[PDB]
Symmetry: C3
Subunit: 171 residues, 3 copies
């Protein structure tokens, strides 16, 4: 059974928010994509690099998350430290992800180039930084998820199966 980590990074949501629209967008998108059974491991944390690092390490090392997706804290603002935390915990970066996510975003907004979203591997776990807006989250995942089930196969993880009328992963 596949375990997928979902991390909402936000001082605001950590302090208390009516709802977590970002985390929800990730869960709903994954539910739309996946016909195979999967289990979300979900945390809401503040913009604190040490905490983000700890959370990702726990998900990958102890909770066997084959994929971990983060949302928030990827811009130029002083407290946006999610990419740094990601780089800190991953041994092998995946530069193709950031490239594509920015390229797709750039079709809409020239500020796409301000995103420091990245991705990498910690051991057998893929970690991908997503943006904050639900619209953007779906657009982002639509672009990169088709490569993800195959990536997990190559890491000797669970075989993810998709609703091919919603998304078509290449293998």
């Amino acid at each position: 059974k596949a375990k997928i980590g979902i991390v909402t990074v936000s001082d605001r949501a950590s302090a208390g928010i009516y709802e977590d629209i970002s985390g929800k967008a990730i869960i709903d998108t994954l539910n739309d994509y996946l016909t195979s059974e999967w289990e979300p491991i979900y945390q809401v944390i503040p913009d604190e690099q040490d905490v983000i690092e700890t959370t990702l390490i726990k998900m990958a090392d102890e909770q066997d998350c084959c994929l971990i997706v983060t949302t928030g804290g990827t811009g130029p603002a002083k407290r946006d430290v999610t990419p740094e935390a990601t780089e800190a915990v991953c041994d092998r970066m995946m530069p193709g992800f950031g490239e594509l996510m920015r390229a797709e975003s750039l079709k809409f907004v020239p500020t796409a180039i301000l995103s420091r979203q990245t991705a990498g591997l910690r051991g057998d776990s893929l970690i991908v930084n997503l943006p904050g807006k639900p619209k953007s989250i779906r657009e982002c995942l639509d672009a990169v998820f088709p490569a993800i089930p195959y990536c997990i196969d190559l890491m000797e993880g669970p075989y993810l199966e998709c609703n091919e009328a919603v998304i078509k992963p290449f293998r």
Copy 2:
């Protein structure tokens, strides 16, 4: 707050004395065309020496409060091209989107665009961007990336840059 913008021409030849710094001029001319808000250029010509480039950038960011610093020169595969190493050394986090788009923009016209090591990053609240050498390329490069720069500076709580929208339209979401 009154905006200060650093302009660094990196060049052994220029540092020894040349007729005119056309790359630096291209930067200042373009920024003049873009900007309606008042701003102060802080300009330095320095040699291709990594440590000197580092010191120059650190001063402009830390002491002179430059919200944007742009460099021209020293960004290819040649031994003495050390502007990107200097930029990476002084920045606390990189802005990979800039190197991507600047290469893509240059690649429109020259296959050797992929040899460019031009990059960008943040040192505290200062954005540092490595630009190309030729005036035509500098303008095309700025046309491509500058639309994102005023919003970047807004996010770093810096001065509000105001632009001539007939010339350039910065995006602010």
Copy 3:
């Protein structure tokens, strides 16, 4: 510049230990470079196992002892744990050339969305350019077609040999 060009070709394979392994990738590289070049050059060719220390050694020998102006690798550039070619390349290079990885992934993403899984990179060690290529002969050729037009000029800038090409097949770009 007048000096005879040496180009390194490194095949990284989990079957390298077997003399009966048929290296179709290394062959595709050699064949491609022969199609491309009209100037005199010599291939320096090694098939090696996917052991990062060995890949590092091979690259360093080719760059530092055998005067290879260009070294191309094939194999070991995906997300699997055993794929350590980019780490070796990063280890031996003193500065990276991010434009190569961008272009190669872009040329590949034209065909497969798993293009973003490639960790192929490129860098300089001293005056030697090192570029990670893919595995399949078709992908190897497509890759080289995309990036090789910038390579002779790169070598010119590092004061290496002047490479000359068969312009019926590939046209290097050289600016002022």
